[PDB]
Design a protein around this ligand. Structure first.
Ligand SMILES: Nc1nc2c(ncn2[C@@H]2O[C@H](COP(=O)(O)OP(=O)(O)O)[C@@H](O)[C@H]2O)c(=O)[nH]1
Ligand SMILES: [Ca+2]
Ligand SMILES: [Mg+2]
Lengths: 219, 167
C-alpha cells in the first residue's frame, strides 16, 4: 500500500571545446578503411584506468584491500546493437567527465587534425591522447557510466552535433570503474561478431597486461 | 674535458621546467617562455667543493617515442620530476615520467628528485603529505620550490647531483 517510487537525476548539458567538436565532425562524417582501431583505443583507455588503481596503491594501501580482479570485459549485444567495454579501473569523478571528455584532450586534438591533413592514418589517434573519439567511427551514440571511490555514479552521453550531457546515474550500480556503451551505426554490426572481435584484438592491442574477456550470447 | 652531470627536467606543460632551469642558469624569472623550445643549458657550479658543469636538458617539444628521442633522454644521468602545487593533473602525471625514465634506463635505480614547484602561490590543490608519500614509495628526495622567488632551486638541482654521486 506504498506511494509510487520515482528517482530524480539532475542533467547538465555542455558544449565540446571547438577543436574536439571539429575532430568529432571529421570522425563521424568520413569513411576510414582502418577504423577497426577504435576497439584498440577503448582497451588502451581501460588499461590506463587499471594502471591508476596500481599507482594509487603505492601511497594508499587500502586500494590493495578490494577483492575485485583488474580486468576488461567486451560485451557485444546484437539485439540492442551495442558493444559495451567494462573495466574495474579507478573510475572518474564528475569533474573528470566534464574535463577529461570535453576540454583537457585539447592540445593533441589540433595536432592530430594537422597530422591527418599531412596524410597520417586514423590509427595514429592514440598517440595524440584522443583515442576515445575514434568510438564515433562506428557508433552514432556513446554512453560512459563511471564510479570513483567516495563519489556518485555518473553517465556521460553524446551523439556528437556539438554537445554532451552529464547526470547522476540512479540505474544499475556498476561498482568501481568505467563502462563505455557504443550504440553502433546500422552498417557497423560486423564489430558485434565474435570472429571479427577476435581478429581485431589478436592484431592491435598485443601487449596490454590485464586479462581481456569477450562475453558471447549463446544463440 | 671537465666533470659534467647531465640532468633532465621533466613534468607536465606549465609546471615550471623552463622557469626552474633559467633561475638556476641565469638567476632571473621568466613569466612566459615558448612551451615548444627544448634546449640544454650549461653552468659551472661548486658542490661539496667539487667544480663541475651541469648540462641541463629542459624537456619540451611534443610527446613522441622515436629512437632519436629515447637515445637523447637515455643520456640523462639524473631526472627532476617537476609538478606544480596548484595543478593536480601534473602530480598524477609524475607516475608517467617515472615509468618512461624506468623504461629507457632499464632500472628502478635512476637518480631522481621530486620537485613541488610554484610553492609561492596561494591556490594549492596538492598537499605536501601526498608528495612526500609518493617520494617515500620511490625512495627519492622531495624539494618544495618557487622558480619565481628562487626558494629551493639550487637545493633541487644540487640534491639531484648528490643523488647521482651515490648511485
Ligand atoms: N608563481 C609561479 N609561477 C611560475 C613558477 N614557475 C613557473 N611559473 C610560471 O608558470 C608558467 C609555466 O612556466 P614554464 O617554465 O614555461 O613551464 P614548462 O611548460 O614546464 O616549461 C609560466 O608563466 C611561468 O612564469 C613558480 O615557481 N611560481
Ligand atoms: Ca600512457
Ligand atoms: Mg618549457
Amino acid at each position: 500500500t506504498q506511494d509510487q517510487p520515482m528517482e530524480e537525476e539532475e542533467v547538465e548539458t555542455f558544449a565540446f571545446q571547438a577543436e574536439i567538436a571539429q575532430l568529432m565532425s571529421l570522425i563521424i562524417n568520413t569513411f576510414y578503411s582502418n577504423k577497426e582501431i577504435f576497439l584498440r583505443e577503448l582497451i588502451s583507455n581501460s588499461s590506463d584506468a587499471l594502471d591508476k588503481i596500481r599507482y594509487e596503491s603505492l601511497t594508499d594501501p587500502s586500494k590493495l584491500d578490494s577483492g575485485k580482479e583488474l580486468h576488461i570485459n567486451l560485451i557485444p549485444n546484437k539485439q540492442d546493437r551495442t558493444l559495451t567495454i567494462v573495466d574495474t579501473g579507478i573510475g572518474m569523478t564528475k569533474a573528470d567527465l566534464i574535463n577529461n571528455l570535453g576540454t583537457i584532450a585539447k592540445s593533441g586534438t589540433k595536432a592530430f587534425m594537422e597530422a591527418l591533413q599531412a596524410g597520417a592514418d586514423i590509427s595514429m589517434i592514440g598517440q595524440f591522447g584522443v583515442g576515445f573519439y575514434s568510438a564515433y567511427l562506428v557508433a552514432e551514440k556513446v554512453t560512459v557510466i563511471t564510479k570513483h571511490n567516495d563519489d556518485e555514479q555518473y553517465a556521460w552521453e553524446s551523439s556528437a552535433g556539438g554537445s554532451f550531457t552529464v547526470r547522476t546515474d540512479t540505474g544499475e550500480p556498476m561498482g568501481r570503474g568505467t563502462k563505455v556503451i557504443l550504440h553502433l551505426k546500422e552498417d557497423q554490426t560486423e564489430y558485434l561478431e565474435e570472429r571479427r572481435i577476435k581478429e581485431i584484438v589478436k592484431k592491435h592491442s598485443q601487449f596490454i597486461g590485464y586479462p581481456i574477456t569477450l562475453f558471447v550470447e549463446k544463440e | 674535458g671537465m666533470t659534467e652531470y647531465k640532468l633532465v627536467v621533466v613534468g607536465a606543460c606549465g609546471v615550471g621546467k623552463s622557469a626552474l632551469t633559467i633561475q638556476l642558469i641565469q638567476n632571473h624569472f621568466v613569466d612566459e617562455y615558448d612551451p615548444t623550445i627544448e634546449d640544454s643549458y650549461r653552468k659551472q657550479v661548486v658542490i661539496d667543493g667539487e667544480t663541475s658543469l651541469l648540462d641541463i636538458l629542459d624537456t619540451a617539444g611534443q610527446e613522441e617515442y622515436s629512437a632519436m628521442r629515447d637515445q637523447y633522454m637515455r643520456t640523462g644521468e639524473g631526472f627532476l620530476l617537476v609538478f606544480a602545487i596548484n595543478n593536480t593533473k601534473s602530480f598524477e602525471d609524475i607516475h608517467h615520467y617515472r615509468e618512461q625514465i624506468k623504461r629507457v634506463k632499464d632500472s628502478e635505480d635512476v637518480p631522481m628528485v621530486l620537485v613541488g614547484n610554484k610553492s609561492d602561490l596561494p591556490s594549492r590543490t596538492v598537499d605536501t603529505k601526498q608528495a612526500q608519500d609518493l617520494a617515500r614509495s620511490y625512495g627519492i628526495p622531495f624539494i618544495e620550490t618557487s622558480a619565481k622567488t628562487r626558494q629551493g632551486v639550487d637545493d633541487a638541482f644540487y640534491t639531484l647531483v648528490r643523488e647521482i654521486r651515490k648511485h
